Symmetry: C3
Subunit: 339 residues, 3 copies
Amino acid sequence: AEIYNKDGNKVDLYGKAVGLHYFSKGGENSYGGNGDMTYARLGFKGETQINSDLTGYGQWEYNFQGNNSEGADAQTGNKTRLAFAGLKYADVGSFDYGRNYGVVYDALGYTDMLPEFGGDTAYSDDFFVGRVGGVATYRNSNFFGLVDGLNFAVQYLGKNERDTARRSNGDGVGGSISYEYEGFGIVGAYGAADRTNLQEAQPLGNGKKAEQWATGLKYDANNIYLAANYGETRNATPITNKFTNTSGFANKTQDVLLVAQYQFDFGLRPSIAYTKSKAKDVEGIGDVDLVNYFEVGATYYFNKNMSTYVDYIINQIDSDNKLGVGSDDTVAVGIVYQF
Amino acid sequence: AEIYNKDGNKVDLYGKAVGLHYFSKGGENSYGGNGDMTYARLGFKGETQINSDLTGYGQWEYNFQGNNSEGADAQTGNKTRLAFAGLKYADVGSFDYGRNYGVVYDALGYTDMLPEFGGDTAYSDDFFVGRVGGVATYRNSNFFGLVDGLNFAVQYLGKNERDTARRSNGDGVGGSISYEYEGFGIVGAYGAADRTNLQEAQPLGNGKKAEQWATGLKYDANNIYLAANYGETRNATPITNKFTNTSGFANKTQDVLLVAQYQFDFGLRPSIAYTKSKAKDVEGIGDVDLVNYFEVGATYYFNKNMSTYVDYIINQIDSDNKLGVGSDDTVAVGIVYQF
Amino acid sequence: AEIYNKDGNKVDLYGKAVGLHYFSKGGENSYGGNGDMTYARLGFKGETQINSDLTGYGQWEYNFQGNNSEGADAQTGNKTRLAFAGLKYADVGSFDYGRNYGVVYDALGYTDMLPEFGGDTAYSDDFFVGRVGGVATYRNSNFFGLVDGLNFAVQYLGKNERDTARRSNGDGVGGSISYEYEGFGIVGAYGAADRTNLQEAQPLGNGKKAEQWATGLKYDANNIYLAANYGETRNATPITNKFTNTSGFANKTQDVLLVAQYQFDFGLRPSIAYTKSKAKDVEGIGDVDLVNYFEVGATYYFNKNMSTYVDYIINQIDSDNKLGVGSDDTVAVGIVYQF
Ligand SMILES: [Br-]
Ligand SMILES: [Br-]
Ligand SMILES: [Br-]
Ligand SMILES: [Br-]
Ligand SMILES: [Br-]
Ligand SMILES: [Br-]
Ligand SMILES: [Br-]
Ligand SMILES: [Br-]
Ligand SMILES: [Br-]
């Protein structure tokens, strides 16, 4: 909630407390796991009027896990999700630097709209598909003011030489283009980047460059939300083989995600969805699925501050998946206070 | 401090900075330890009017330790203490889920009122006696509106299969009942829960179920505060033997806690107390004390934002306690800014 | 931003999001390193009117690193920087206890004014030169009201027996005196403290007492800022030898730091600086430099909420420094949103 506007600056300290429990059969061979998954968020989002053609802004957001004891495990799952600052200059564009959303998420955002799950391909610290560190992002709305509805972005991703290959990346460049009109939206995004010597020393994966792309289509108007994403990747999508205790990236994946939702006046928002990501040319296994489910779920909004929800993952992953991916369904039930 | 009310929601971001030092003789064989114990708290507490019969609410609260260097020990003692959200429906009751106070703390709260120490039996992540993860809590004030002063609660505790037996728990159920009138209060609470295979593989403890109960009596009115708790436990109270480098739970404990306090108009709040928890049927030791002291202490309130305090623990634990429990007294001196 | 004043208390929750990147040649043999260094800060600062001669106050401030993945490295560089509470009584002085600035920083503060780097001798958890835990600090402005411009302080540092010698300290006492008038300022500060048995078991260092002192001169007025610090140390300044994989403290250091800055009306603030700390009588090496550079940098302030900056470290450290200290220059470029 905007707790502060004076002079020319408004600051919004914000958060949520999310009482959350997953129900699976027993969580080891499941999709989401089983048990308490309670967490909270806290952040600030700020914007200052420097002059009439120029604003400056910043954002930070942290995740606190609520499902750890107060002993030595207390920090498990705690992390900063965003931290960046930027300037936006009238007709010219915005420029921000920090930990932000990777630019292909401009497409994956179309379907990442389920109450609890969804967005399975938007991995954190995975080049351009999710949140990631060290990106410079330029964004332009309405093509310099000359074409209403036509937007684009470019993003420079700095090398992050980390101790895990899963969380590292080389230097890279990505971009996105979107056009909206009378409720319809279409988007494409693509990015490529160098892979580190660590990522390459691993078994799964082969190549010195990583590539991700996705297109998105969506209808959003008259209480209806429909959206579809299609995407591929090379040497980008992290994957593990749990039988040989093995890990790396899938040389190839192709991905589809569909979502349909309606929002009633009284506050019920039903959702259905479908998602499948299939890895290909995986060293030692061949073609294999990483994600494959239908979803049914719903969110009840009491108001802008309070919601409850249920999310049910009908998992079509099969019982002999050669990487060991989980076969059982998961339900999540949620109660959220936010401000 | 309420930093935000608008529409129908009020949010209180809150905290304290607590300059705190313990004085013992040398801290190894003491009650509280010796040295700097500075810390801060930060949280939000929120409540939204959904309609005239229904409110939604949430709370989060974190502890930052102020007595760690800025190097690799910097996270020591940092943790989320609370994180939950709920709804409260008029005459019907409240329901919240998340990390919250266990329901037998509804009784132990009577005596957990000392400036620095006290509440020795309200262990964190120990079934129903302190803060704990994965509880669903229902609470009813004034018996549906039909009996002023008569309150009750029930709590469902979900299994937390953690890597330490100290911080794990099985599934369980607990409850409390209280009646207050013209300044007097009486309360009882009880809970039981399954113990994990980890808790059971340990030496101290025997049984596949954990049980805790306590009653409370208190007088609170005319600047006087008097309160008394009595409690027992089986396979619930965590305990260590420091000679054999051994740990587990005490098959039995019985506990007493008494407190007397007066609050002067000018801001001095003197306190005296007594506490003893005795473990029984402990494998290899027999009956032994875990806690045994008198306390004298006082808090000076300058106003609702500033206090200072001293707390002195006259430790009756004896010099040959067979678990090694500390024999020396501890003094704490404190300076607190809070908002 | 002051988000809260009512009754007699005002609370300022505050922070910044700092998009930050370092450019060195390749970061291993450099001054600052290379890559993303994004971070955020968050804190509260509060002050309550207890009466007309007495205020109470508190402060907490945390650092969140923005350059870590969301996996297991997520906590790297996260820490509390300050946490203390105190009272200030009219003409008599202030007294605070907690994690605060060590008192010789009252002198080193004169030159710690560069956009990104600078203040190389104000080490964290290093007795009196930087931030440190367990200090009681008394401060007096204007000599009890009797001498405008003449200020002083005394600080008691409690032993911190930590697991690293780098972050530990013995008991100690330090102080500072300053006089300002018509834009000029002069300051001296000194402190000494016992060293732990851990600090002494290390190779580099010899002695059971640690000592730090510095004087400061500064001119600050008419948009001009000039300042100079001189300082020495014994058994205080932490140092590593990277060839023998060795660490400890330098028995002796002498240090100089100079800064010149001008602030234009339109918001450009150019800076130049020079810094050299030379360690002496180092076991096995003799006399050697720890820090030696010129700096050129500038900060552009759009307003009180937004800035950008560049900081360039022309490193005079030489290519065969016997401890291995880095020889290459570093540039930092920064974009800061703050409130
Ligand atoms: Br937690
Ligand atoms: Br992820
Ligand atoms: Br990051
Ligand atoms: Br700390
Ligand atoms: Br505890
Ligand atoms: Br928890
Ligand atoms: Br980060
Ligand atoms: Br440091
Ligand atoms: Br500290």
